[PDB]
Each structure stands twice: as structure tokens, then as C-alpha cells.
RNA sequence: CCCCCCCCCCCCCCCCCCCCCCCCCCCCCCCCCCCCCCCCCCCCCC
């Protein structure tokens, strides 16, 4: 029963409440216990409680005396219990409660008036119960109640009388999910004082019942309406007619298996701002299908269209000018679809669009013709996502229409070509370009000469070729900050590849083959490709096969903080190499061949660190080579994980395995 | 405060309609903080709830199954009244009819009509029938039943020729104006009205009553208290 | 000028012969020197010479006095000199010479009689000279001369008179290669006393001239006749008519670009025993093409047939019963051919065949139907070679006709199937089966149950599957001696896989994944799959990833001699492991992680060895772990290559790199 | 005897991720041989 300010007793197998806790405890948690009964006599000591979570237990019934000992209680949680009986005195003395959870209590019927005696209640939960009617009392109470949950019940109708108790209550959420409701009575929602949101997830309504619901929702203050998994197979221009008289802003139609969308179906939602259509089965989207939605600010179409079938090849076709009505659209999530391709008028009309995601949106977008994004000429796009589209070729002037583009995501594709440099024309405001996980890329002298504003360039596992050209391909990128060149099997790097990149901060070169470039036997001398990077912060050189470190590689990294050198073949290091690393924070040298750690090389490096990884190193336990290192280990504040588990000497056999 | 004035014939021929009117002053018949109802009392029995109506969203009425097929309680919003229409009367309908205000939230009755005696001619709460007490001696009136441990118990006092007076509500609460010597308790399936030092003015009939889920209101048989 | 019994002066750039050598030297070699002249006055000391190789020099002329100083000379070599003038006194005193090389001496004309004065000459060479006629004198001499070479000369005719000097000489070899001979005179070969072999390689004869040659070769004692690269495009039944009257046994027709072979062409060679046809362009072999060759004992057909051409797909077709005439055939080399496939009568009639090679003999022999080798039912085959035939499937009873088969070579194929065990039925006398370098093989319990006589089984780089069956697939192979299972990526081995194989001697398991089977943390205990192999001699376990050695793995290898454990991850070894290796000869532990070599483990192993390979090991220079090893290194007779080059300690840094 | 709600614990299956070892293929670099070619220099023959 650990407790400093709140009390936790979760999964402690308690049968009775403890009697030794501070008097001024505010939270008392007893989830996942076996409290058969909860006598109130044990609560005399605990008279300062605010939250009382006694859920996931086996309490049969409570007593009103429990509320007497708690004068300031605000939270009462009784999830998954057997409290199937309620009385007027059960919650009589409790009046400051702002939360009441009764989920999965097997409550059958609300008898007379269990919730009259409280007026400050905010949230009430009755999910997973056996209730058949929404009647919670005879008179009107629950003045401040804002959220009411009735999901997973056995309610089959919503009569007007049963909600007469909410004639002056502002309901911000009326959860009625998983209830087989098949009849709606007139005035059922008009009787509610102020209904702001309705949730009917997993409720088998159907199109006609949905229309009846919308008609019953006319001339009310609803703002949200979730109809997820409602078996809404088909919509028409009259399905949402009843919403013409309201100001609905959020509508959810996910998992409804919406086979087709009718013409002018959503013309009755001029105030809609958030529309959801994810995980549907739409086979055809008409030009006027999205008519009347000129105020939507966020549209989701993830898996909204039908998948390909070899039987008929029923690829979901999108008609031209289908998105012309979304004038105020600002976010279009359109991932995991099977569209045949992009047309010249697919995205016409989106004059306020700022985010388009097309991750795996097309079956085969092999070639990015310069006329592909012509429909996005007037769209002020900022972020474009094109991952998992199986793109195989990008022609010149492909992105010449996205003048406002800032982030381009072309990763996780099969792009195999030579970057002539004309593919990036028109990206005057580009900031980040992602190209990782491609087939193979062949850089040229002027590959990135048309995008001087670029700041991020990720090329992880792309099999870079001709990166060792005499003019550095990264020279025009004066504002580059993050560069990733990992898993490219790079062999040759020129010393001037990173020349002029003063603002570079994060550089990744792990999983490459640069061992030869740093050995002293390399013809032409070692390659010092890390000169001039005064602002470099993070360096990654894992699995490079390095066997020798030149003395003056890190001679100018005055602001280096994180350096990675794990999974290498380092055995000896030059003296006085980390002198300029005055602000080093993390040093990684795991899975290396280092046998000696001396102050002459690791002195300045161990000045003020916060992490250290030298686990799988065959250390040599000798006072000439390890005594200083173990002495530094003894007294330090740097975090060294698995210090006593893997920091084991290998030689001599006298100290074989001794930490 | 609230005045309820009843009016109507005190004599009805059999098989006719018994019509009475309760006129409200100092309150509204459409009030969302009260309910308006009729109960009756014959000397061969105690108190019997007949019907009730309350203005919440639409007009809702609840009737006792004994007279459900005959009774009718309609409000007159234009005149701030409510009526009582009991068809097919029979000398078994001869009784004193009271109109009353049920005060939320306990449905205890704080205001009664003067009562109209009507003659027709051409759950169980159990109380001891009688309790005799000396002046200054504490009186204890018990009330047993299954509603005791499941509902609040109200206690009413009725002097001869007068409407009942609520002396205790919600098993122990005492309305203002009632002497402090009155108190109530509820232990198990037995409620108890204790009159500490019964005075001569406390000699009356005491009825225990409670709310009830199917039948709305249930009254005890009544206990005659005598100050010797 | 190193010399102990013979004198060698090759590539020493000598100008004059040395004057300080033992008198009793028998061989004096001066190849690749610059001896302008060879005075005989310097040969007074050297009077016991038998061989005098002065070839590849620049001697202009010799003198007869040279022979006077050498009374017992037998070999005179003058290759690649300028001795273009010969006289009767040049070789007068020399009479014991049994060898005389005059290759590339730019000899123009033999004037009168340079070789009369000797009678014991055996071999005479005159290759790469400017001779135009085969006249070497006027009278008859060279009684014992057996080999005469005249290759790469400028002889254009073979007149009868020019060979009149060999009327009583037995010529076993008359080399006349690379001579543009275009006319043959009658009696040219009849004048020769006893001609046994003629060589006309690279001589542009043609069919008609070949027939004229054969006619001129009638009724002589010839036995060999090489006509390689003679541009013999076509043969007929009369091309070799002149050989009807002789007893020719060896005939060479290689590189002749023989497009077609005529019907009954070789019916005139009943005594032929060795026939060569390699590297030809035969497009069709007739049934009677090889008629009359019932005495051939060795036929070579390597690349004898035309290659495939995409223009016409002219696959060389072999008619049925084409080899029916070779009754006494015993060796058929038939590699690198483009035959469409094997027929039911392709090999019928070979009743004495004992060796058939079909390495890359067919373009696509995908399936080995059980009727494929029906033509070999009566052939007593012993060795069959089927490499590089792109065999993809072997059906049951495929080798049911080869009852006498002993060696089967099915390696370097693409055989991917499951060995049900019925493929080897009928191999009652099989000894060796080769299956290395296949696609993938799936063994079964009874894979080799039908061939108990098997002794060799090579399965290198075959991707073995289901080798860990509960019954050992090698159990029926009671006489197995050599087993190769390398590069198969084998993961799981049962301890009883090699049970009962007492006669096993050589076992290969290198380049596999058996590290888990020997670690102590392996569930079920370490696998001791090397028990009962009392006759094991060679064990290979390279690149297995081993990290720990169980103590009792080599507890029964009483006759182990060669053990291979290189390229592993061994760091420590159990004490007293090599006790039973009393006859160990070679121990290989190169490229390991061993840091300590102690007598407790390597004592018995270093008893009496002959080789040791521990080059790339990070040894720990410490008197507790290396002192015994270096002391044993100091005094020993075992061969340790690169002892001072790679046996370098890695730790401590004080001894870093010190041998 | 039945229908359910919880607490604890032990197996089994699927998927994701990480790590060790190994195989195959490929890339970069180096070395050792074989063949061919080119140039420089010296020494002779016709």
C-alpha cells in the first residue's frame, strides 16, 4: 500500500480496507481487489477523501453511512461490481459528487429516484448495465449533469417521457452506443434542455431509422453526432434532411459499410466542420456527392473506398471536380485507398487546403508526370505525404505547381532513378524532403541546386550512388540542418562533401562502409569530412567498421553533444581527440573491441556527461588500462545502464567475467 | 403560504359522477416544484391515495389501480385549480376527500384541503390500532412492512374533523412549526414515531406512510393515541 | 650459380661461362642468358658434362673444339639462338649425343651433311626454323633416331627424295605441324624405314589432301596420326580409304571444324583404339556414322557437337543406335555439348562401357525419368558424371538400370525435391554419390535405405532440410566413410544421427549453425553427435559460430588426426578435452576469440603435432595465460606458418602488437 | 443444479519489435597468380 499523497491498492488482493493511512489522504484507490462488503465504520479515520475508486471489486451493496464519513468526496468509482439495487438514501448525504461511475454493475431497473438528492453531479456513467429504459427518476434533477453514458445496455426505445427529467439540463454527451434502439418517439430530444452531442456507435439503425433520427433532431442545439458502425449502407439527399434546422458541426460515419453516397446527400450541413468517413466501402464518388460542405475544415477518408478485387477489378473511381465544394478544407487524411490514379481535376477547388496525405492511397502511381499535381496549382499546400505509393519514377517539373510546399514525404517507395535536379523546381519554400527506404538513388552535382531553402534531407537505406562527386551535391543547401545517410552502404566520401554547411546540426552515417577512409594506410591520406560543422550536435557512426580514428576529425565540433560509435571495430584511439567536445552529453561505444580506457583519450570526453554505453567491450582488467576507468565509474553522476551486468573484463583469465 | 380550498357536492346518487374542485392560492398548478393530488379516507379504513398530476414537460398523471378506470384529475390553468372526477360511484366511495400538495423531493405533503365529505346514496404498512399514554410519558408508535427498509417513512397527525398534518418526513426529519418532542426512527422493517413527553394536545390519529414504486403512495392503518 | 649436383644459371644475366664449378658436374644449365659467343677454351675444366642446356641465348656460331672437351656429353640444347650455319665438323667429334634441340635457331638451309658423324642420336628437334625442304643430308645416317621435329617451318612439299636418308630408321614421331604442305609425292613415306607416328597439327590440308595423305600412308607401319586443326570440314567413306591397308590405332581430328561426318566414313579403321573428336562443329551424327569402329577403347566428344544458336535452334541431333558399333568402348568423354536429351536407344550396343561422362552434355535435362537410362541396361557402367546438366527432378527408379554403378556424380545441378529413397533403387554396387551444389534437398527416414553399400556422400551447399528426423537417415549406410555437410546452414542435429557409423573417417560440418547445440543453456542438454566414431580421422567445424565446447564431445575419437575449428567464436575451453586425441596431427583455431592457451586444455593436444593455425587470435600476453604457450613455441618441431607475422597479442596495450 | 460478475495463477495460439549466431547474394577496397597489350633501355643477326 504505497502512498505519499494518494493511496494505491491496485492488484494487492485486499479483502478489507486498511486502517493505517494518513488522515489527510485525498485519493483512495482500491481497483482489482476482493472487497465483498464495504462497512462505513472503517471510514471514520478517512474523513478527508476526495476520490474513492473501489472499482473492479465484488461489492454487493453499500450503505448511506458511507457518505456520512466523507464530507468533501467528489469522485465515486464503482466499476464492475454487483450493486444491482439503488435507493433514495443510497446517495442522499453525498451531494458534492462531480463524478459517478456505475459501469458493469448489473443494474436492472432504476426504481424510483436514486439521483434526486444531488445537484452538483457533472458526469454519470451507467454502461454495461441491464437497464431497459432511460428513466432515471420521476421528477427533474441533475441540474449540472453534462455527460450521461448508457452504452452497452438493453434499451430498445427512446420515449419522450423517459427523458422528461432532463428538461433543464445541458447534456454535452448522451452516450447510447451498443443499444438495439429501433423506435424514436416525437419530442424525445426536444424534452432535453440542451443537448450538444449524441453518440450512437454500434447501433443498428439503418437508413430509414437514421432519417427518422435526423427528423427528431431538428431545431435542437446539437453540435456532434457520432453514427459509427450504424450499418448505414446507403445515403440519399433526404437522409440528413432533419439536420437542416440545426447547426451540426461534427458528424461520424465510420465503419458504416457505406457502399454508395447519394447525389446531394450532404447539402443539408452548411455548418459542418469535422467530417469522418474512415473504413467504409464506397465504390463511386460523384461530382455533387460532397455538395453543400463548403465549411468543412477536416475530412478523413482513410480506407473510405472499396478495396481491389480480382473478380471484377472494381477500383473506386473518383469523378472530376468531386472536391470542388470543399472551399474551406484544411486537412484531408486520405490514406490506405485503392484509387487508380490522380487526374487533372481531382483536387480542383481546394483553395484553402494546407495538408494532404496520400499514404498508400493509390494502387500503382508508378510515374510522377509533371501534369499529375496540376489540380493542386492554386492549393496552398504545406505538407504532402506520398509514402507506400510504389512510386517508381519522378519526372522533371513534377512539383512545379506546389509553390507553397514545405514538407515532402516521398519515403517508403520504390523510386529508382538519377536525380538530375529538375524534379525539385518550383519548391521555393520547401523545408523538409523525405526519401528514405527507396530502391536506388543516383545523385548529381546539381541534384539539390534548385531548393536552397531545404533544411531536412533523409536518405536512409536508399543505396546512394555517385555521392563522391567532385562538387558536393549538398553545397547549395546552405540552410540544411538534419541529414540522414544511414544504411546506404556508402564507400567513398570526399572531404568537401559537407563544406559550407555551417548550420548542420544532426548528421547520421551509421551502417555504412567508411573504414578505409580513416585508416592511415589509405592512399591520399585520411578523409576529414567533418570540418566546418561548428553547429553539429548529433553524430551517428554505428556499424561503420572503423578500425582507426584520425587525431583531428573532431577538432572543430565545439557544440557536439551526442556521438554514436557503437558496433565498430575500435581497439585503440589517438590521444587528445575529444579536447574540443566541451559540451558532450552522451557517448556510445557499445559492441566494440576497446580494451583500454585511459585519461589521455577519455579524459576530456568524461568531463560532464549524462549517458554512457560501453557494455559489450572486452575490457582488460589492469591497473595500467582500467584503473582510471573504474575509479571514474565509482564516483560519477553519468547514467551508465547495465553497469554491473555487461561491463565484464575478458582478459586476463584471472579477471575473466569479473565486473 | 399555500391555501387549498375544496368545493363540490357532498352528496351523489349511485352510478353518477363525483366531481370536486381544489382551488390553489399562493402557488401554481403548473409549478415544477410540487405535485397536486387527491386522497380519500373512510372511517371503515384509513387513508387511500387516489391520484396525482404534475407539470414537468407535458401533463403527467398517475392513478391508483383501484379507481384507475373511473378517476379523472384535470387541471384548470386558467383558474389555477385541479378537479376530481370519479365515475360510477357506489356507497363504497362514501368518504372524506382531501386534495393535497406533494412537496419535492420526498413527495411529503405540506398542504391539504379542508376535506369534503361525500356520501353516495339514493404494499401494506401495519400499525398497532391503539396506544394509551399518560401525560408526560413518552409514546412510541410502530409501523412495520416491506416498504420500511426500502423507502423513506413519513408520519402524519390527524385530529378529529381536520386534515392530516405532517409531523415527520424522511424517517426522521421534522418540518418547522412541529414541536421538538416529535421524532422518528427506522430500524430494519420497523419505523417508530417517538413523542417524548406526550402532551394533551398530541392526542390524535397517527398514520405512517411511504412512497412506493408501483403504487406511488402507501399509508399505514393508523394508530389512535390517547393521553390518559 | 647454385649447384650441388647439377648447375643452374637461369635468368642470372651471364655473359661468359663461370670458371669456378666442381669438375664432376653432369648438368650445366645456362638458359635465359646473354652468351654472345661460347669459346671452347673455357671448357677445359668441365670435362664430365652430360647435359648442356645453353638455350634462350644469343650464340651466333659454335666451334668443333667444344665437343673435344666433352667426351661423354649426351644432351645438347640450343633453343632460341642464332646458329643459322651448320658444317660437317660442327657435330663431328660429338658422337654420344642422344638429344639435340635446335628450335628457333633461324636455320635457313641444311647444306651438305651436318648429322652424318653421329649414330647414337635419338631425338632431333628443328622447330621454328626457316627450312624449306626436309633434306638433312645426302647419304643415310641417324640410325637410332626415333623422334624428328619439323614444326613451324616453311616446308611446302614432302618429296620422296628428301626422306631417302631415313631408309633404315625407325621414326616414332615425325612432327610436321604448322607447315603449309600442299603436295605429297608417291613413296614419300614408303622411303622411311619404320614410321610409327605422324603429326600434322595446324596444317591446312583439306579433305582431298587428307585422302591423298591416307593413300600415301597405305601399307606402312603407322600407328598414330594427329590431324588436329587441319580444316577437315567434311569426311566421306573414301577420305580414310588409304588407312585400310595399315594398322592405325590413334587418330586425332580435334579443332578440325568437322561440320558433318559422312556415312561409313570410319569403316576403314578396324584396329582403331583411341579416337579424338573434341572441339568440332558436328550438326548431325548418323546411325552408320561410327560404323567399323568395333575396337575403339577410348572416344572423346568434348564440344564435338554444334552449339545452340537462337537464329535457327540447330540443336545437334544424335540418331538412335548411333553408338551400337562401339562394342569394345570403355571410356566416353562427352562433356560440354548441347544435346536436346537422352533417348531410349542413344547408348544401345555399348556392352563393354565402363566410364560415361555427361558433364554439361545437355541443354536442359530437367527430369530424370526412370526410362532415361534404359539404353544403359546392359552396359557395365562404373562411373557416371552428370554435373552442370541443370537437372531439376529425379523420379523413382531413375537408376534402376545401372546395377554395376559405383560412382554417381549429380553435383553442380539445380535438383530441388524430397528424397523419398526410391531414386536409388537398383544401385546394388554403389560406392560414392555426389550431390553438392544443388538447389535444396529434403531428406527422409529411408532416403538412403536402398543403398547400404554407399561409402561417400557429399552434400556441400545443398540446403539440407529435415535432417533432424528421429530415425537417422544415415543409419542404413553401415559402410559410410566420408560425409560432407558443409554450407548447408544446418541448425538442429540429433545425437543419434551418426549412430552405428563405425567406419566413418572424414566428416565435414563447416559453415553451419550449430552454436546452440553445444551451449550449456540449450534445453535438453548439449548434443553429443560425435559419439561412436572410433575411426574418425578428419573433422571440419569451421564458421559454426561455436561459443562453448562440451567437455565430452571428443571423448571417443581415439584416431582423430585433423580437426578444424577456425572462424569460430571460441573464447574459453573446458579442461581435459583433448585427452583421447593421442594421434592428433593438425589443429586449426585461426580467426577465433581465444585469449588464453594453457596446458590444462592444450597439453595433450600439443603432444605430437605437425601443423598449427592460430594466426588471428587476440592473445593475452600474460605469464598466467601465454607463458606456457610461448615456451612451447620456442622449442617444438610442429610447423607453425606465419608465427612472427600474425601471432600478436592484442592486450594489454603494453604488449599490443608484440609477437 | 443453472445463468453471470470479479480476484489470483498456469498453459496454448497469432502478430509486432529487439538481440545473438549463421548462410546465401551483392557492393567497396586490397593482395596473390595467369594471359594479353603498350612503352622505355641494353645487346646481336640478316
Do residues A361 and A336 make contact, with C-beta atoms less than 8 angstroms apart?
Answer: yes
Q: Does B150 touch chain A (CB under 8 A)?
A: yes
Dig out the grid coordinates for C577 from the structure: 578435452
CA distance B209 to C641: 113
Most distant CA pair in chain C: distance in Å?
94
Most distant CA pair in chain A: distance in Å?
94
CA distance C394 to C422: 10
Between the alpha carbon of residue A598 and those of residues A605, C8, C303, the distances in Å are: 11, 59, 68
CA distance A78 to C73: 121
Taken as a whole, chain A contains a residue count of 659
**Which residue of chain C comes nearest to A626, CA vs CA?**
C652
Do residues A109 and A132 make contact, with C-beta atoms less than 8 angstroms apart?
Answer: yes
Of A89, A141, A167, the CB nearest to B57: A167
Question: Residue C631: is it exposed, middle or buried by C-beta count within 10 angstroms (0-12/13-18/19+)?
Answer: exposed
Dig out the grid coordinates for C575 from the structure: 579442461
Interface of C with A (CB under 8 A): 571-572, 595-596, 618, 620, 622, 624-625, 650-654, 656
- What is the spatial distance, in angstroms and rounded to an integer, between the CA atom of A619 and the C1' atom of D30? 30
CATH architecture of the region C481-659: Alpha-Beta Horseshoe (3.80)
C-beta atoms surrounding A572 within 10 Å: 18
CA distance C378 to C331: 16
Do residues A112 and A133 make contact, with C-beta atoms less than 8 angstroms apart?
Answer: no
Between the alpha carbon of residue A221 and those of residues A105, A122, A217, the distances in Å are: 32, 19, 9
Provide the experimental method for this PDB entry. cryo-EM
Between the alpha carbon of residue C103 and those of residues C50, C78, C81, C84, C124, the distances in Å are: 20, 7, 8, 11, 10
Report which of residues 499-558 in chain A place their beta carbon less than 7 angstroms from any atom of strand D: 513, 516, 523
Resolution given for this structure, in angstroms: 3.9
Q: What is the CATH number of domain B130-227?
A: 2.60.40.10
CB contact under 8 A, A164 and B56: yes
Best CA proximity match to C549, nearest among C586, C517, C581: C517
Question: Could you check: is the Cβ of residue A58 within 7 Å of any atom of nucleic acid strand D?
Answer: yes
CA distance C39 to C19: 12
Between the alpha carbon of residue B106 and those of residues A211, A632, B60, B206, the distances in Å are: 41, 77, 18, 19
Could you tell me how far CA C577 lies from the centroid of its own chain? Answer: 41
- C622/chain A closest Cα distance in angstroms: 7
Between the alpha carbon of residue C394 and those of residues A203, A647, C398, the distances in Å are: 62, 56, 7
What is the DSSP code (8-state) at residue B202? G
Please report where in the chains the cell 552535382 appears, as a residue. A445
Counting Cα atoms < 13 Å in the Cβ hemisphere of C306 gives 19
Among protein residues, the one whose C-alpha sits closest to the C1' atom of D23 is: C489
> Where is A211: in which H helix or E strand?
helix A207-216
b/e per residue C564-588 (b: at least 16 CB within 10 A): bbbbbebbbbeeebbebbeebbbbb
Chain B residues with CB under 8 Å of A116 CB are 105
b/e per residue A498-534 (b: at least 16 CB within 10 A): bbebeebbebbbbbbebbbbbeeeeeeebbbbbbbbe
CA distance A397 to A410: 15
CA distance C463 to C457: 15
Best CA proximity match to C30, nearest among C65, C61, C58, C60: C58
What is the DSSP code (8-state) at residue A372? G
Question: Could you check: is the Cβ of residue A235 within 7 Å of any atom of nucleic acid strand D?
Answer: no
Mode of pairing for the β-strands spanning B153-158 and B165-168? antiparallel
Q: Which residues pair with A394 in a beta bridge?
A: A368
Strand, helix or coil at A65? helix
Question: Residue A655: is it exposed, middle or buried by C-beta count within 10 angstroms (0-12/13-18/19+)?
Answer: middle
Cα C176–C179–C183 angle (5° rounding)?
95
HEC sequence for C536-596: CCEEECCCCCCCCCCCCCCCCCCCCCEEECCCCCCCCCCCCCCCCCCCCCEEECCCCCCCC
Do residues A148 and A177 make contact, with C-beta atoms less than 8 angstroms apart?
Answer: no
Best CA proximity match to C538, nearest among C473, C589, C585: C585
Could you tell me how far CA C375 lies from the centroid of its own chain? Answer: 30
DSSP C267-321: TT-TT--EEE--S--B-EE-TTTTTT-TT--EEE-TT-BPPP-TTT--PPEE-TT
Dig out the grid coordinates for C220 from the structure: 606402312
Mode of pairing for the β-strands spanning B81-86 and A619-620? unpaired
Would you list the domain boundaries of chain C? Answer: 481-659
- For the CA atoms of A623, A626, A627, A628, what is the dihedral angle to 10 degrees? 130
| Cα-trace Rg, chain C | 33
CATH of B3-120, one of 3.40.50.10490, 2.60.40.790, 2.60.40.10, 3.60.15.10: 2.60.40.10
Question: Residue C24: is it exposed, middle or buried by C-beta count within 10 angstroms (0-12/13-18/19+)?
Answer: exposed
Restricting to A residues 561-590, those with a Cβ less than 8 Å away from any Cβ of B are none
> Which nucleotides of strand D are protein-proximal, with an atom < 7 A from a CB?
4-8, 20-24, 27-30, 43-46
Dig out the grid coordinates for C530 from the structure: 560425435
Of A89, A113, A161, the CB nearest to B105: A113
Strand, helix or coil at C220? coil
Best CA proximity match to C238, nearest among C256, C255, C273, C213: C213
CA distance A539 to C423: 60
CA distance A209 to A215: 10
- B93/chain A closest Cα distance in angstroms: 29
Q: Does B152 touch chain A (CB under 8 A)?
A: yes
C-beta atoms surrounding A594 within 10 Å: 21
Dig out the grid coordinates for C253 from the structure: 581430328
CA distance A334 to C45: 104
b/e per residue B21-48 (b: at least 16 CB within 10 A): bbbbeebebeeeebbbbbbbbeeeebbb
Best CA proximity match to C463, nearest among C419, C408, C523, C518: C419
Question: Could you check: is the Cβ of residue A80 within 7 Å of any atom of nucleic acid strand D?
Answer: yes
Amino acid at each position: 500500500t504505497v502512498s505519499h499523497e494518494v493511496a494505491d491498492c491496485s492488484h494487492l488482493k485486499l479483502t478489507q480496507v486498511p486502517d493505517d493511512l494518513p488522515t489527510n489522504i485525498t485519493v483512495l484507490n482500491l481497483t482489482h481487489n476482493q472487497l465483498r462488503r464495504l462497512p462505513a465504520a472503517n471510514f471514520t479515520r478517512y474523513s478527508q477523501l476526495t476520490s474513492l475508486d473501489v472499482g473492479f471489486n465484488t461489492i454487493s451493496k453499500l450503505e448511506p453511512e458511507l457518505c456520512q464519513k466523507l464530507p468533501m468526496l467528489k469522485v465515486l468509482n464503482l466499476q464492475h461490481n454487483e450493486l444491482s439495487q439503488l435507493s433514495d438514501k443510497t446517495f442522499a448525504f453525498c451531494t458534492n459528487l462531480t463524478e459517478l461511475h456505475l459501469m458493469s454493475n448489473s443494474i436492472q431497473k432504476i426504481k424510483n429516484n436514486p439521483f434526486v438528492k444531488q445537484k452538483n453531479l457533472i458526469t454519470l456513467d451507467l454502461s454495461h448495465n441491464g437497464l431497459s429504459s432511460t428513466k432515471l427518476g420521476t421528477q427533474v434533477q441533475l441540474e449540472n449533469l453534462q455527460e450521461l453514458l448508457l452504452s452497452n445496455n438493453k434499451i430498445q426505445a427512446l420515449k419522450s417521457e423517459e427523458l422528461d427529467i432532463f428538461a433543464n439540463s445541458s447534456l454535452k454527451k448522451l452516450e447510447l452506443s451498443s443499444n438495439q434502439i429501433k423506435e424514436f418517439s416525437p419530442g424525445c430530444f426536444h424534452a432535453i434542455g440542451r443537448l450538444f452531442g449524441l453518440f450512437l456507435n454500434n447501433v443498428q439503425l439503418g437508413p430509414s431509422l437514421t432519417e427518422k433520427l435526423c427528423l427528431e433532431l431538428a431545431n435542437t442545439s446539437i453540435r456532434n453526432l457520432s453514427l459509427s458502425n450504424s450499418q448505414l449502407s446507403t445515403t440519399s439527399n433526404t437522409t440528413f434532411l432533419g439536420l437542416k434546422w440545426t447547426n451540426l458541426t461534427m458528424l461520424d460515419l465510420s465503419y458504416n459499410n457505406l457502399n454508395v453516397v447519394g447525389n446531394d446527400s450532404f447539402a443539408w450541413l452548411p455548418q459542418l466542420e469535422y467530417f469522418f468517413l474512415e473504413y467504409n466501402n464506397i465504390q463511386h464518388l460523384f461530382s455533387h456527392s460532397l455538395h453543400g460542405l463548403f465549411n468543412v475544415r477536416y475530412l478523413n477518408l482513410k480506407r473510405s473506398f472499396t478495396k481491389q478485387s480480382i473478380s471484377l477489378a472494381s477500383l473506386p473511381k473518383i469523378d472530376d471536380f468531386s472536391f470542388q465544394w470543399l472551399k474551406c478544407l484544411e486537412h484531408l487524411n486520405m490514406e490506405d485507398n485503392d484509387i487508380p490514379g490522380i487526374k487533372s481535376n481531382m483536387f480542383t477547388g481546394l483553395i484553402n487546403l494546407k495538408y494532404l496525405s496520400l499514404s498508400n492511397s493509390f494502387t500503382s502511381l508508378r510515374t510522377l508526370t509533371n501534369e499529375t499535381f496540376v489540380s493542386l496549382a492554386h492549393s496552398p499546400l504545406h505538407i504532402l505525404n506520398l509514402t507506400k505509393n510504389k512510386i517508381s519514377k519522378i519526372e522533371s517539373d513534377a512539383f512545379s505547381w506546389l509553390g507553397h510546399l514545405e514538407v515532402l514525404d516521398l519515403g517508403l517507395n520504390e523510386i529508382g532513378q538519377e536525380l538530375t535536379g529538375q524534379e525539385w523546381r518550383g519548391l521555393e519554400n520547401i523545408f523538409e524532403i523525405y526519401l528514405s527506404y527507396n530502391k536506388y538513388l543516383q545523385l548529381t552535382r546539381n541534384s539539390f541546386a534548385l531548393v536552397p531553402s531545404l533544411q531536412r534531407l533523409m536518405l536512409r537505406r536508399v543505396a546512394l550512388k555517385n555521392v563522391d562527386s567532385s562538387p558536393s551535391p549538398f553545397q547549395p543547401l546552405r540552410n540544411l540542418t538534419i541529414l540522414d545517410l544511414s544504411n546506404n552502404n556508402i564507400a567513398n566520401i570526399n572531404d568537401d562533401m559537407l563544406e559550407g554547411l555551417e548550420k548542420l546540426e544532426i548528421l547520421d552515417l551509421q551502417h555504412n562502409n567508411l573504414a578505409r577512409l580513416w585508416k592511415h594506410a589509405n592512399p591520399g591520406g585520411p578523409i576529414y569530412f567533418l570540418k566546418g560543422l561548428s553547429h553539429l550536435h548529433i553524430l551517428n557512426l554505428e556499424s561503420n567498421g572503423f578500425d582507426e580514428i584520425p587525431v583531428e576529425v573532431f577538432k572543430d565540433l565545439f557544440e557536439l553533444k551526442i556521438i554514436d560509435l557503437g558496433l565498430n571495430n575500435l581497439n585503440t584511439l589517438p590521444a587528445s581527440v575529444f579536447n574540443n567536445q566541451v559540451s558532450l552529453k552522451s557517448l556510445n561505444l557499445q559492441k566494440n573491441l576497446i580494451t583500454s580506457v585511459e585519461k589521455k583519450v577519455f579524459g576530456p570526453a568524461f568531463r560532464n556527461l549524462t549517458e554512457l554505453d560501453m557494455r559489450f567491450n572486452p575490457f582488460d582488467c589492469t591497473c595500467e588500462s582500467i584503473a582510471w576507468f573504474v575509479n571514474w565509474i565509482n564516483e560519477t553522476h553519468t547514467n551508465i545502464p547495465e553497469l554491473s551486468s555487461h561491463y565484464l573484463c575478458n582478459t586476463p583469465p584471472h579477471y575473466h567475467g569479473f565486473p | 403560504q399555500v391555501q387549498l380550498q375544496q368545493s363540490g357536492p357532498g352528496l351523489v346518487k349511485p352510478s353518477q359522477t363525483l366531481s370536486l374542485t381544489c382551488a390553489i392560492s399562493g402557488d401554481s398548478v403548473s409549478s415544477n416544484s410540487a405535485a397536486w393530488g387527491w386522497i380519500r379516507q373512510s372511517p371503515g379504513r384509513g387513508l387511500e391515495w387516489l391520484g396525482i398530476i404534475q407539470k414537468r414537460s407535458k401533463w403527467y398523471n398517475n392513478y391508483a389501480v383501484s379507481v384507475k378506470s373511473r378517476i379523472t384529475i384535470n387541471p384548470d390553468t386558467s383558474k389555477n385549480q385541479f378537479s376530481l372526477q370519479l365515475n360510477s360511484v357506489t356507497p363504497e366511495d362514501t368518504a372524506v376527500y382531501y386534495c393535497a400538495r406533494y412537496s419535492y423531493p420526498f413527495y411529503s405533503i405540506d398542504y391539504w384541503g379542508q376535506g369534503t365529505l361525500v356520501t353516495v346514496s339514493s404494499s401494506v404498512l401495519t400499525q398497532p390500532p391503539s396506544v394509551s399514554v399518560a401525560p408526560g410519558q413518552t409514546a412510541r408508535i410502530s409501523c412495520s412492512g416491506d416498504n420500511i427498509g426500502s423507502y423513506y417513512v413519513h408520519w402524519y397527525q390527524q385530529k378529529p374533523g381536520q386534515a392530516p398534518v405532517l409531523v415527520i418526513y424522511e424517517d426522521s426529519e421534522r418540518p418547522s412549526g412541529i414541536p421538538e418532542r416529535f421524532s422518528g426512527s427506522n430500524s430494519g422493517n420497523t419505523a417508530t414515531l417517538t413523542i417524548s413527553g406526550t402532551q394533551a394536545e398530541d392526542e390524535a390519529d397517527y398514520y405512517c406512510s411511504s412512497y412506493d414504486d408501483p403504487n406511488f403512495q402507501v399509508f399505514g392503518g393508523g394508530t389512535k393515541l390517547t393521553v390518559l
